[PDB]
Design a binder for this molecule. Structure first.
Ligand SMILES: NC(=O)c1ccc[n+]([C@@H]2O[C@H](COP(=O)([O-])OP(=O)(O)OC[C@H]3O[C@@H](n4cnc5c(N)ncnc54)[C@H](O)[C@@H]3O)[C@@H](O)[C@H]2O)c1
Ligand SMILES: NC(=O)c1ccc[n+]([C@@H]2O[C@H](COP(=O)([O-])OP(=O)(O)OC[C@H]3O[C@@H](n4cnc5c(N)ncnc54)[C@H](O)[C@@H]3O)[C@@H](O)[C@H]2O)c1
Ligand SMILES: NC(=O)c1ccc[n+]([C@@H]2O[C@H](COP(=O)([O-])OP(=O)(O)OC[C@H]3O[C@@H](n4cnc5c(N)ncnc54)[C@H](O)[C@@H]3O)[C@@H](O)[C@H]2O)c1
Ligand SMILES: NC(=O)c1ccc[n+]([C@@H]2O[C@H](COP(=O)([O-])OP(=O)(O)OC[C@H]3O[C@@H](n4cnc5c(N)ncnc54)[C@H](O)[C@@H]3O)[C@@H](O)[C@H]2O)c1
Ligand SMILES: [Cl-]
Ligand SMILES: [Cl-]
Ligand SMILES: [Cl-]
Ligand SMILES: [Cl-]
Ligand SMILES: [Zn+2]
Ligand SMILES: [Zn+2]
Ligand SMILES: [Zn+2]
Ligand SMILES: [Zn+2]
Ligand SMILES: [Zn+2]
Ligand SMILES: [Zn+2]
Ligand SMILES: [Zn+2]
Ligand SMILES: [Zn+2]
Lengths: 343, 342, 344, 342
């Protein structure tokens, strides 16, 4: 039984507080399913979307959220998942399937893609319309609150770690132990890497140590590049999940020669890439954008096997503005997940 | 018959004019050979050295030159080339052979390497001591003046094009059609790529068209990214050989999604890497530093087969200051090569 | 619009090894995602002969209209078709794929276990009309030469992907073994990819074709041992592509490689060949099967042809002559490719 | 301090029993060191050598052994390790350092290589001459008996696993849980792989399970391809360490589409490669031969961190003939290591 209207956190304009509104519940069309949202992780991208930080703007008005997980309650024609299935609705909400990028295994680069909680309404709501062809597939007995961050934080850093090409037994630095970074530490350990964690607050490094990091460095107390070269001779790879350009520049510093640094974090603007050093050391800098459907299933398998556990605190849908305030202040221990079915 | 003394172009202090001096000729030690220099290409790296543009500084005083080619006239013990061999003395003058990087095929990254015309004296002289294990091997009937740029300009851009991973049938942009860039156009065509050439003067683009470029862009008159995306939907790869940071940023602009841009040019400082675009488009930015001994042989084979031919103008060793002046003001058509033999 | 007849002529095999017969076959209306293509030409692939003879362990449907180098014009569209009436298209081996499995999502739709194969599991281009999945057809330029372009739809895309699968770089040596339908365009793709090319076959006329199409070395394996000759001449191959229909060519393909060489396999004779273990291990030999190409491989392969870098050697035949065509194919008497001129 | 003569296990003719002989101890020449052997692992390659199974024959007479580990007791000129260093002397005893293969990271393919205990005398002796540039470097407090198999069994399967390109979270099959296979199980788990183990005797699969295998298959009782496809849909990769051609054929059977099977085992003869299946499934078959000096250091690091521990039983040098007879009958639990210092 599906209600006619639902509660959803809606933003009207950039930088405005979100407001809980009553929205009509839509019927799914072709390929679509209607998902009853059990939980939805809060990604920093939702904050970038609310604030309009990016040159590519979201739609307005907007229901954010692309870590939404729940149960399929209605299917349109040609749906690829059935009622009762547990699914997640991620950033890569849909792709065309017939372009250069989709056909070659790079559907994350499809120029016709739609983005959940950005170009179409997302999981900050009691129900969400999803394209059944691109949802994450969850086990029926999944813990919705704990699995939610895998739909973006998890798949993103997992794909990012593959993009660094760091091998088992090599060193990777994770810079920014937030929502993305704290699961990045765990994926990297499950991939056989030694892990150095970089942040700017000691409690973030305490989280990394709990989750398996072999080294921790507070960039405000210690220059990361000098410290990691001194300790172990520099990193084979690095993954930048931080929201500050200076972390990107320091990420270059921590690499040994032929290192590869993958970029997830999306602050506005640029960082200075030192040319001489990048050339003489054969540094590779590579942007990495969420993950394909195959990346997503692989990332979920790591969580299903207990190798990756997101650190989660539940919040109510109505408190989303307080969640964004804590996020702006760096006060979140891992991820906040909205418990939408719980209250 | 080897002289005790020789003429050499020597720099004494940064930014100072070079002077032709009489310097001693050394006898080669273990693994070393003494090479009689027939020609030596003038690389912009030589200018960065004499000006001290880089944070890692050269020795001072310094004989520059790492595009030197000539004939072996004396061998130290355990030399790996013989008297009469035609050889080249490149930037990767020597490497340790036993580190992580040398063992895995990346001897260009050896942290114990020595660099010709930078950390050791180079080819701006009548004779040069070389490590016989790292010289380029030339055919006995080589044209020394024409082959000289392959020893750095050639091997560098050839390896750089490999580092872009651009495939046959894909588009590469070459930025800066100078010493490196004008042979990069030719390697790229020989590797099956379509080639877009970018520079800031029309005569550089005329050279590129002459050498096979399919598109040309004067970045001063036309935004490279806008034009190449409009014309062909953007580049699969780019190779930056230019000496200005903005060329690196415009190099990012011209790429399509999943493009890879390889960096050769070595201007001082940094360029602004746009984070959002690099992430959402899966852009790969990769530094590329000369080439291994295997890269160098491959680069020479392309030249020997007539697929790549450097555009060369000779100058006398005493004219090196005039050469650098033309280089600073961008008036060299391809490469200058010092005709040290005659 | 186009006046589509209720029946058409098609070359049909009723049982394995039997001669094909021109039959009056009903013309089908396209369903969802489907289009009806009026066939202008269809290349004859040796796979069509393996299909008619039932050579393979995975059997075709029977009865069967062969042909997966069919090219023509769309004359009818089903619902949700992805090409429109009047478009020039080709109907390849990879007739359709699921689009949502592990292989489809990761760039390997040629490995889709739910794929259908043109002229094998579904009726193909040996007919005046063919039903196609509009999502997987090759896209041709409106002014294409249908007879000349047809082999790119399988011979061309296959060897192009195969050459990529060898990982042979510009300036390196590749050997092409079997200068037939696939091999004679493989020579040209390899040259356009900057490779030096050695051609191997067992009849001098095939090596004459390879030389005329750009091969740098030729060897008749009956005249000269290929491995010894190519190691003597240039020190062995960095890569090899086996397009031959005889297992001994696969064994000799191993011989021609230098250390760290990669040999990609296209040819599909029944049975196996002997892989020498000691040699393969000590030399780090890589043997890699290669199966047609993705939609992206196909567009790339067609781009080489459109630019004049690859030109199939083609002789026209009538649909009614298909049995003589197969006879010539069995005796090794085809100079490159035979293409059925169906429109004329 | 160093004797003029030593005991060594020597084979005089193919298939003959080895005899313990008194042989002179040699002085190390240039680049060479003399190693006092603490232990030496027994590799099936040693048995292939003694029996002359391979078309490339060893030197005769021969001291086998290329898992020898010990202490440097004397250095020739230009030695790269010092007296007192703990080292191992592997299959890749020396390489040229200047060919196509050495320069590109593939020194295991060097056509000028010498092979320890095959083309030069090896570790089945109280002392062994080694090339100081190619020895494995061991920690001073190493357990010599337990580390010895890493010098060939360990580095070989570690490199072989890299050659399969199996990723963390994917399935690899290890075929043959012997000297190589039982450490292959451990490297694969440390590389994040799920592991299926295949052999022809239940005790070999018990060893695999104790060392971390997730699935085991007795190929004599159960078809591996049928079982592994039914259980998990086939393997992303396979590593063949077995000594019988049928294991190679069955290794093909267990792969899913786009699987890669790497070959370590070196039985004489060939195996039947099914052409249709290899093509339609895009199967990659890849030979893999020991590992480079970098591979070797990486493999030792896994052992030093406790992620890989060889299953070892000590034997005396005089027992080598019964060790080979146990090897022929498949009765070795992992590796036998000659305890030479004891
Ligand atoms: N590329 C992708 O596919 C993708 C996907 C999801 C999120 N993101 C982006 O990743 C970024 C992080 O997202 P999140 O949800 O993890 O955010 P978050 O707010 O949970 O955590 C950010 C972390 O960065 C740390 N940090 C700040 N300055 C730092 C510095 N100088 N050095 C090191 N660490 C520093 C903070 O202490 C904090 O731990 C955002 O920009 C988001 O938009 C990208
Ligand atoms: N990485 C390596 O291995 C390596 C090897 C050799 C040289 N280099 C470096 O490469 C650079 C080029 O060397 P060269 O000898 O070819 O120099 P060069 O002086 O011959 O040519 C430089 C070229 O850049 C062009 N250029 C300048 N501003 C430009 C802009 N905004 N956009 C595009 N093109 C622009 C100039 O017109 C000129 O054609 C130097 O920094 C040199 O040190 C690096
Ligand atoms: N893997 C794929 O994707 C794919 C695609 C298309 C075709 N094929 C297969 O490729 C094979 C060839 O097809 P085709 O259409 O080119 O056939 P074809 O009959 O036109 O040519 C076969 C060629 O092999 C030569 N040959 C025969 N014995 C030889 C030997 N011992 N050594 C070297 N060459 C020898 C013949 O002389 C002839 O030139 C067939 O088995 C076909 O089914 C595979
Ligand atoms: N390629 C290399 O670099 C390299 C290095 C070292 C050794 N090797 C070779 O690897 C092989 C094995 O060496 P080892 O020391 O481990 O030998 P081993 O005798 O210790 O082990 C061989 C194992 O194979 C098993 N086996 C036999 N028949 C089998 C079958 N049908 N299926 C599966 N398993 C089967 C046996 O039960 C035994 O467990 C030898 O041929 C040796 O020469 C190669
Ligand atoms: Cl799940
Ligand atoms: Cl030359
Ligand atoms: Cl076309
Ligand atoms: Cl050790
Ligand atoms: Zn997100
Ligand atoms: Zn798309
Ligand atoms: Zn080195
Ligand atoms: Zn230079
Ligand atoms: Zn599929
Ligand atoms: Zn075909
Ligand atoms: Zn061994
Ligand atoms: Zn060598």
């Amino acid at each position: 039984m599906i209600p006619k209207t639902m509660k959803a956190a809606v933003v009207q304009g950039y930088g405005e507080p979100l407001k809980i509104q009553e929205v009509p519940v839509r019927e799914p069309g072709r390929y679509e399913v209607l998902v009853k949202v059990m939980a939805c992780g809060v990604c920093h991208t939702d904050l970038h979307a609310v604030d309009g930080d990016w040159p590519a703007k979201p739609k307005m008005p907007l229901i954010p959220g692309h870590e939404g997980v729940g149960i399929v309650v209605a299917c349109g024609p040609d749906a690829m998942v059935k009622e009762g299935d547990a699914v997640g609705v991620p950033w890569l909400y849909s792709a065309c399937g017939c372009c250069d990028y989709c056909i070659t295994g790079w559907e994350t680069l499809c120029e016709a893609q739609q983005n959940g909680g950005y170009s179409v309404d997302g999981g900050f709501a009691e129900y969400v319309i999803a394209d059944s062809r691109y949802v994450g597939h969850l086990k029926s007995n999944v813990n919705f609150l704990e699995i939610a961050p895998i739909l973006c934080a998890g798949v993103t850093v997992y794909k990012g770690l593959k993009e660094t090409e760091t091998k088992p037994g090599e060193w990777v630095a994770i810079s920014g132990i937030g929502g993305l970074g704290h699961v990045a530490v765990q994926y990297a350990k499950a991939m056989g890497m030694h892990v150095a964690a970089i942040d700017v607050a000691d409690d973030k490094l305490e989280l990394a140590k709990k989750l398996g990091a072999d080294l921790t460095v507070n960039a405000k107390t210690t220059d990361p590049g000098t410290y990691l070269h001194k300790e172990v001779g520099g990193m084979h790879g690095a993954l930048i999940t931080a929201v500050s350009p200076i972390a990107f520049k320091q990420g270059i510093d921590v690499l040994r020669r032929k290192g590869t640094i993958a970029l997830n974090g999306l602050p506005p603007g640029s960082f200075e890439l030192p040319i001489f050093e990048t050339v003489l050391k054969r540094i590779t800098v590579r942007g990495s954008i969420v993950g394909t459907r195959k990346d997503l299933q692989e990332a979920l398998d790591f969580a299903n096997e207990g190798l990756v556990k997101a650190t989660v605190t539940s919040a109510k849908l109505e408190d989303i503005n307080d969640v964004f305030d804590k996020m702006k202040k760096g006060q979140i221990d891992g991820r906040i997940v909205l418990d939408i079915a719980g209250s």
